Symmetry: D2
């Protein structure tokens, strides 16, 4: 069954039980493109913002209290997730988010009406607002919340897991590799201190975006001038948003025209996630190479078994968490290109790529948050080192000749390494065989310098 | 709900939701990869069902799989292919990069369906007989992508090409000013411009078709590493024959090289690259159309787009080019998806590229978005455009560059002085040519008028 | 003619007058790929770093003063650009920069030898060093210098030019446009204040990368452990570098393994340039659209003529500086993808994409620096506004009905706007014709609300 | 030198360096675009010279340009095409996006050369007769790109394909352990892996060839906006005939649609996309090769790469895989260049895409990098690889996954227990099968040894 609703273009048949109205239904028919709509966090921010705007409009005497309280109560239901099935509009809608803004206005109107209070979706629920400031405001609320409350705490869990291994393995000597070739000794702990620093720097990179990611366009209305909103509307709404979210990073935009003509802060936020994707690729690739084998690979560490590896090769177990991490990183890199493409292509007073940009930046936050915690807890925490094998690798590298450079010179040290490899002799015995024990190098000094744990220079 | 049953695999016991048709390995993957909250698409589960039925058919034909087991597997696989069990595939896209988990998801659900019908089949020994995830999962990916290209995207692009070509003919004499660098140029017709858009989409179809010889290559039969170990001789060729008969897609074929087909996913990178060009073309077409529709009074106002919904929650009565916005946002998504596909494609190792589920998600999404938005763009926007022909002819006549056909008579430098003086003095080109004393042995008044006619200047063919 | 030099792989024929030696010549033959090598700024940083390392090795008593002074003098010649033609190696060399490191070591050895001092390219000129810490150090020196001393000052020039127009045009009313459609009034000044903020925020974005862009790997030697360098070598060398460059943004890396296993700071710096490319695309596109015409476009502003526009259409002039800007932005976006691709693909103790990453990040700094200044000085500064045309456009938008929403309601205001367009009437006359003057809207209030300059709500 | 002479264009007089062969408009562009400090490449100036000569030839054939003038332009254009005047093209890549400046650069230098030979020709009226920048500059870009693809890149890829295919044959029986997910898998041969690499390069050639029908499309004849205004009937067809005769490239053709050919550069996006796939393939090949050469003692040590230079300024005697490093860095550059090309390609407006010089720079660079590094990779790395065959056969025999052929005899789950017990007790698969009491009616000792032979397991025949 259907019922008739109307907008300024005419009457529209709407499913009888739906809480949306005419403009949402038009958008259902105009944009059946991906079949996916707003995320939970986006509908939360829309509900939060519509409640805050009604509160301020009531505070200022522009909106009657009976109407404002009914809107506040309905918006709270939306923010809480009680009506997510009432937001059927595709991501790939009009690029201002007008349709999803009106979706929220219409659903609020229907909830309020069922409670005996008539509010107009435009005149009341959208009072003092445009899609052009509210929709990017909800996007930046959701992204700031994702960065502060979800991603950074997940990166902290991962940094801690890596740093714990850096400490546990501080004296687990192994052969360094550069260009994939035998190098001088390092410890596993040293390598994991590098990974931990990459994640720590990732947190610094996300934090550096927050002063502009947290900028909200609310109050600029149609074009940035604030037309049809009272003086200070944006400042007053942001104050309510900070109180409701506990996110002091939210703020009014430095320039109200920049905040609507562009979404540069979303490009910036995505760029930090892109670096984290780059860092995680290196960490996860190293960890699965360390776990490669057990007999045809490096066999440096053992990853926790998480599931049977193979439908055909029995007993084989694969590095599935590194695979999830590196695939997530690839997705973040692609999403980042989509965000930047949208960001560059604003025109005059409005960038109309907001729903697409919002989808991609919020997804990148979600993927990185979730996979970083899983990587920490289901992979890093349970790694074990094959320390005996690692020392054997360290002692087998021909590059352990390197600390002899100051005693015999680079060219002779190179001759030592090549002869040792050719004759399948040790560095120590080749140094002796080449007659190098003498005024420039004693046996005692040779053995001191070839000690691989000392050569790793553990701090 | 807290109701569970205990299933097991070679790794141990797992609690599984009591009503779920999946079993231990799927449940492990549910707990290992809660990353995006989104799993396989309908088309991926369709291809998994189709492939598992085809493998059972061939194993049975060869006498390797008992007919009673084969019947139960074929019937269960058909239910999956038909979409009766999509809620039984809970595994994230961001799973192990071979698709082992979704392969085992299919094997386990088939075993549960067959068991409910009174036939015991083993998910590994029977449902996965002669198979690996490493050949079956990219096979289902290339089936789904080939089907998307041939049966969905190309028909949608044909609809859009036809709508653009129809306007190219309808508007073949609707003269307007060309614009180059956004500046007044010489006359064109709207129809000429739309013939260009139509060619871009026609070329886009050519680009998709050019990918099909390699997009349609399937790894099936190569099993674990490409050698076909534990598969019967010619198993993959026989399975592809079933797949071709079942899908009606002659583009499906065994891979030229069985190692290339598992060590790499270069065919998906190739297919994505064609979609990327289409995104590039659509961006130009959609941008031109919304600029031509800009206004009503402060823009170019060359054409009118069909109204599709109220434009604005605050500015009353305003209507916006929402379909060009959907197109250009889809194009941005395809560009990003394409970068993700190429990133995964480059990073295979030895016998297997383990980025398949991510690559699959992105290529299939790009196919879906372009298919759906191209049809909407054609039918809800292009088909109903109207032209503001009087305004367009005035624009054509107003460009100072209509002096251009006089180059051979008065020379480039004098023609430039004509154009600059006409604009400064707010005079027509014709009157400025007269005022500068250029009418004479080199240029008659009748010749001037012939050369300045803007419709003739568009050289409509 | 040729002479023989040797390395640990054997003897190599080297052009007789070349200052490089065996390992540089091998690299000439191994990597003829792009035909382009290190940039001036990269050879400057190599010379600076080799001089600083010799200074510290001498300070610590590890390198004899006669050798150290000869290396310092030779390295200064290289830093000053006296020997750029002695660096023939392709960008697309071994990904540690080993070849360019040895190029610098060999050229220094030859210069010192011609001055009568023998120094060994490995034992002396490379003392306490690896390619794996020195080459990324020189890259981060060059990139930090580019950010601080070249790009930020150029962006400040552009921000100032945009802000000056924001003030000059503070009250030049026009029609806003959203979705390319007629919107409510703005001023040209307000739009240019938005552009100025984008560039100001771009400077903030570059500044934010400096704490990690300025991290130097020097001292970590082969793998990050500092093997074969004295205690505190990196700290001592960075101190010399800071004193020599005046760039206290340069600093020792927080973690010596991160600083060699990855080049994440270059990815970060490129990402800031990518945002600036995104911002400049919007600014330049708006400016060329506002200049479009003269008679078939928006014709809001006049760009300074810079050159004849057209070889065929006579007297036509085109927005060439916006075109240069938007093409530079495209290049930065592509370079940025190359940098990130290299950044992700390190292995164990070393990322071996450094020469390629260095090329792309330094190019993006150069292009953005140079085009930002040209954009400011050859385009923005000389823009003129077509103020009467702009005022007419402001008055022509049907959306000037918007301030009546609180008096007549959204739905009636929409009917007013649609009827005004259909009948080719003003909003004011349509309001009157629809009988809306009354207890909800007086004629005086209608005229107060339809004032388009007041509707733009110019501040300050 | 500070001496100047006066030249002029339609904007006024310009001081030009006294000895420069360029004139007023080139000098303006020198001052307008000091951005990268790099200008056109050799191949771009060659194509400009070729095209200007062809246009003068056709204008002479049609009686539109006097033979003495046409001959002098043809001679000057040939001097430019052959490289005698490359220092007379000082304009930046990042110029006006139609290439107007480089077009006028060519027109002005030709006029000066002709004048020094005693023949007066006007840069616009004569040297640019029947032409626009908007058709000639993309025409020269597509000539250069088509030539790069056909005459340089494809032959270089054939050298690499041949090198890989030769190793596939040489190593067809060199058994080793497969690796999937980086973990021990079932046997393959090095030859099989290299047959996969060879197919990747063969497919890369197919991908480049597939772009040629549209890469070879030339805009010449469309002049300002695609209408052909101010060019004689059939001018483009006649010029293309000259270009095909002179270059020997039958792929050069008139564009299917003259508006698409100037409003967009979609064929450059398409050509770049094929190079992007080649970069993806080469990354996989080069990564595998440097991993196989990793060591000598702490890595996989499967093969030995030719020594090309000392590896390390500090670690003595170390040698590094420098050619795989060059390949993978070139691939990164191609990926980035490809993103730049697509960005420019999407952003045309109305009758002209004004990103041509930037797009030209990036596509032509990608062709050059891939051509040169593919040949070096083949000749300085692939051809000289040697295999460590004894070590490889030991790796093949060491993989616990060689239990796989026993699946049909003992079942997947019991085979898992065999592989697991073998690893725990450091015993062979064969011994573990005996120790678990599996020899009997289902599996004999002779059948076990047949199934465990690793070279037979690689299924080379």
């Amino acid at each position: 069954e259907y019922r008739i609703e109307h907008d300024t273009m005419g009457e529209v048949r709407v499913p009888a039980k739906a809480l949306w109205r005419a403009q949402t239904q038009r958008a259902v028919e105009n944009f059946p493109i991906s079949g996916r709509g707003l995320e939970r966090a986006q509908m939360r921010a829309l509900g939060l913002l519509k409640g805050a705007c009604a509160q301020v409009n009531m505070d200022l005497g522009l909106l009657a209290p009976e109407k404002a309280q009914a809107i506040i109560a309905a918006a709270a239901e939306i923010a809480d997730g009680q009506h997510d099935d009432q937001f059927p509009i595709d991501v790939f809608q009009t690029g201002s988010g007008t349709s999803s803004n009106m979706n929220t206005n219409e659903v609020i109107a229907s909830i309020a009406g069922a409670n005996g209070v008539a509010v107009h979706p435009n005149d009341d629920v959208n009072m003092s607002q445009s899609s052009n400031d509210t929709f990017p405001t909800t996007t930046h609320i959701a992204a700031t919340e994702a960065a502060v409350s979800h991603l950074i705490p997940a990166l902290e869990i991962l940094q801690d897991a890596l740093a714990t291994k850096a400490l546990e393995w501080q004296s687990v000597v192994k052969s360094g590799r550069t260009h994939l070739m035998d190098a001088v000794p390092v410890t596993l702990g040293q390598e994991f201190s590098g990974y931990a620093r990459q994640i720590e720097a990732g947190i610094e990179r996300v934090r550096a975006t927050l002063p502009r990611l947290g900028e909200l366009a609310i109050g600029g209305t149609a074009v940035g001038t604030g037309l049809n909103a009272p003086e200070g509307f944006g400042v007053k709404v942001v104050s309510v948003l900070v109180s409701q979210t506990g996110l002091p990073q939210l703020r009014t935009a430095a320039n109200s025209f920049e905040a609507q003509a562009a979404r540069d802060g979303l490009v910036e936020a995505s760029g930090a996630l892109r670096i984290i994707a780059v860092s995680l690729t290196k960490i996860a690739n190293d960890i699965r190479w360390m776990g490669s084998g057990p007999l045809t690979g490096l066999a440096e560490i053992q990853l926790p078994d998480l599931q049977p590896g193979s439908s055909i090769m029995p007993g084989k177990v694969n590095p599935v968490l590194p695979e999830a991490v590196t695939q997530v990183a690839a997705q973040v890199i692609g999403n980042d290109a989509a965000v930047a493409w949208g960001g560059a292509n604003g025109a005059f007073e409005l960038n109309v790529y907001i729903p697409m940009m919002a989808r991609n930046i919020l997804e990148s936050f979600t993927l990185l948050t979730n996979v970083s915690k899983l990587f920490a807890q289901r992979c890093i925490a349970g790694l074990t080192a094959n320390a005996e094998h690692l020392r054997e690798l360290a002692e087998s590298s021909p590059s352990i000749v390197t600390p002899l450079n100051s005693a015999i010179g680079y060219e002779e040290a190179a001759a030592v390494a090549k002869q040792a490899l050719k004759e399948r002799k040790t560095i120590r015995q080749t140094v002796i065989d080449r007659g190098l024990i003498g005024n420039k190098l004693s046996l005692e000094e040779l053995d001191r310098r070839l000690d691989v744990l000392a050569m790793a220079k553990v701090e």
